[PDB]
């Protein structure tokens, strides 16, 4: 992976090529939008790191990704992949949420399609014709 003209990110948080004699390593594999890539970093007060995957801020390994529009985007439409954009409370690091709960920002119960009742998961909507920062990147977070 270090000697690879195939991955686009390579963000480790060169010496780690031989520094690795550590304990167990976690590999986080997922697919993002090409403009969402900024929010895959520590901090990042935005929709991806607040609601989809929050990252730790002090110790971290590596973050790598690469263009997968030919695989993970469909010309007639990849509406399969979703992402959280509404949640009462931002994520902490290592936290994972699968709750498909109808969002009501006022803390009240919510039965859609009534007022202020939305679904927390927008489809990606990736075609082969979309813009650059709008494709599916297979992200490997280490």
């Amino acid at each position: 992976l270090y000697n690879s003209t195939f991955f686009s990110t390579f963000k480790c948080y060169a010496t780690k090529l031989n520094d690795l004699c550590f304990s167990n390593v976690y590999a986080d594999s997922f697919v993002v939008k090409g403009d969402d890539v900024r929010q895959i970093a520590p901090g990042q007060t935005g929709v991806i790191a607040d609601y989809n995957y929050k990252l730790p801020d002090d110790f971290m390994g590596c973050v790598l990704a690469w263009n997968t529009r030919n695989i993970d985007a469909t010309s007639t439409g990849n509406y399969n992949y979703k992402y959280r954009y509404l949640r009462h409370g931002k994520l902490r690091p290592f936290e994972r949420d699968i709750s498909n709960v109808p969002f009501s920002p006022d803390g009240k119960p919510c039965t859609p399609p009534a007022l202020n009742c939305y679904w927390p998961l927008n489809d990606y909507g990736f075609y082969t014709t979309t813009g650059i920062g709008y494709q599916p990147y297979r992200v490997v977070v280490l």
Binding site: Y85, F103, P105, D106, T129, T130, G131, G133
Partner: protein, 544 residues
């Protein structure tokens, strides 16, 4: 939560689904206009109606959210454009009958033909055939009757339909708490809560009429000068102090005097600046021209073209059975994908129109940071002005020297520079009183200040004073010759052509102030000026 974040959460699902469903429709709009097929027009109206119905749902669900509740400047203007009632404020069948009139007006104005008085087998539509007569023919009386023909065969058929049209649109406009449907037009430019650049609806009338008094001297320069040239081409047909005959104005209605260059050229033997003889010299293609445009954009500091532009566009005509409409239009579909349908040939005008439509793609790249409803122009006049900056600046021969088409040692005397710029003055200065008269007539008719038996009388008398055009055949009220024009008959506001032409030269001199061009303003190019890139880009990333 506060209603502000409820208004944001309403737009949050909107700005990702209306991003989707507009790009659904605009893809289907693209693939029919580039592959003309009955299945593609089926799915274009399938996706276009599902887009409008999804727009129908989210407009009415925003009608539950009052605009006088939120102090956030962004979602105020978002919900304001959402919860406009529009045609929903009349009755259920009255606005449908009103749109049945728009169905029947637009049908027989596109179908309506004129037929020759000696050969009724030879019949002509608006384009081609009749506008070929009204822009190229030399006969006085053949152009005279054909001018009368387009105002008689479809002007009379538009008139009782235009009677019923202007009443129900005014009842539509007054039910949305406006003065008239001229005031519903004037409600477009109004902004509330933005200091310095506020704009009343009365501001639009008075600002157009103010700076038109700056236009009027140079127009009356052009008015008196083309009367002398047309007397020399039409001896004793045109009065020496009387106004221009309306069948001799180079076009169908009087908007452009550009086709008078055959009859109003001072020095017809001086050459014209044409560089297409050098385009084929180095064997250029459309891939050279759009890349040379892209190089001309990046020469001033603008970013390059997207990868998705080169993947998804279509800048040649696709030959056989895959049919494509060849009007050069910039197609902003969504999801960061920008494309242009243009049948680009090896042409100096296709060279300039390439910069024009990709100049709209420049503005598409810069509102892209904004959300979907601020992914627009601010008013209706900022799009075409942005596209025409690159048309004017890259048409100057100093750019044509640097590209290698025109030789760098070639001379540009002011005898050939005035004649080309007077040809452009027939276009730009010719359309400003025509537009000024056009809405001002429309203002008073929808207000009710012009009676129905004085519609056609005030129409042609305003051409006598504003446009300086006496009608050669008098028109009573059986005509609807303003509706003879395509904008009035089919629900267009025409004031945007005025304000764009104002703003594009407010922007050009401000660009030429940023370009620091040493010579004249009509010889000004923005080449290699990084301040001209920053000043242009800056006021382009704001959007609405």
């Amino acid at each position: 939560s506060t209603i502000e974040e409820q208004a944001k959460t309403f737009l949050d699902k909107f700005n990702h689904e209306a991003e989707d469903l507009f790009y659904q429709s605009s893809l289907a709009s693209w693939n029919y206009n580039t592959n003309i097929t009955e299945e593609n027009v089926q799915n274009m109206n399938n996706a276009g109606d599902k887009w409008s119905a999804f727009l129908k749902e989210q407009s009415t669900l925003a009608q539950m959210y009052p605009l006088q509740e939120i102090q956030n400047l962004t979602v105020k203007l978002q919900l304001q454009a959402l919860q406009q009632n529009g045609s929903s404020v009349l009755s259920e069948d009255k606005s449908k009958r009103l749109n049945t009139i728009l169905n029947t007006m637009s049908t027989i104005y596109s179908t309506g033909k004129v037929c020759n008085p000696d050969n009724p087998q030879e019949c002509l539509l608006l384009e081609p055939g009749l506008n070929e007569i009204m822009a190229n023919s030399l006969d006085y009386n053949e152009r005279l009757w054909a001018w009368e023909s387009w105002r008689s065969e479809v002007g009379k058929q538009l008139r009782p339909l235009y009677e019923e049209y202007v009443v129900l649109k005014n009842e539509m406009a007054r039910a949305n708490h406006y003065e008239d449907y001229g005031d519903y037009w004037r409600g477009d430019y109004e902004v509330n809560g933005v200091d310095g650049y506020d704009y009343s609806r009365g501001q639009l009338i008075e600002d157009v009429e103010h700076t038109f008094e700056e236009i009027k001297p140079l127009y009356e320069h052009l008015h008196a000068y083309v009367r002398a040239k047309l007397m020399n081409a039409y001896p004793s047909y045109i009065s020496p102090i009387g106004c221009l005959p309306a069948h001799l104005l180079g076009d169908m209605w009087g908007r452009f005097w550009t086709n008078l260059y055959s009859l109003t050229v001072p020095f017809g033997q001086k050459p014209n600046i044409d560089v297409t003889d050098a385009m084929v010299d180095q064997a250029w293609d459309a891939q050279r021209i759009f890349k040379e445009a892209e190089k001309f954009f990046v020469s001033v500091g603008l970013p390059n073209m997207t990868q998705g532009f080169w993947e998804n566009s279509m800048l040649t005509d696709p030959g056989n059975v895959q049919k494509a409409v060849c009007h050069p239009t910039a197609w902003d579909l969504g999801k960061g994908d920008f494309r242009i349908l243009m049948c680009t040939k090896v042409t100096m005008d296709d060279f300039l129109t390439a910069h024009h439509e990709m100049g709209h793609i420049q503005y598409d790249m810069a509102y892209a940071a904004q959300p979907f409803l601020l992914r627009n122009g601010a008013n209706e006049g900022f799009h075409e002005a942005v596209g025409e900056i690159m048309s004017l600046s890259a048409a100057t021969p100093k750019h044509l020297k640097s590209i290698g088409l025109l030789s760098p040692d070639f001379q540009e005397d002011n005898e050939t520079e005035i004649n080309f710029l007077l040809k452009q003055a027939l276009t730009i200065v010719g359309t400003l009183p025509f537009t000024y008269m056009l809405e001002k007539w429309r203002w008073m008719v929808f207000k009710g200040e012009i009676p129905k038996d004085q519609w056609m009388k005030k129409w042609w008398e305003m051409k006598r004073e504003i446009v300086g055009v006496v009608e050669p055949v008098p028109h009573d009220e059986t005509y609807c010759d303003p509706a003879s024009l395509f904008h009035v008959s089919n629900d267009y506001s025409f004031i945007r052509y005025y304000t764009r032409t104002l703003y594009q030269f407010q922007f050009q001199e401000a660009l030429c102030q940023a370009a620091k061009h040493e010579g004249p303003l009509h010889k000004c190019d923005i080449s290699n000026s990084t301040e001209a890139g920053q000043k242009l880009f800056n006021m382009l990333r704001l959007g609405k």
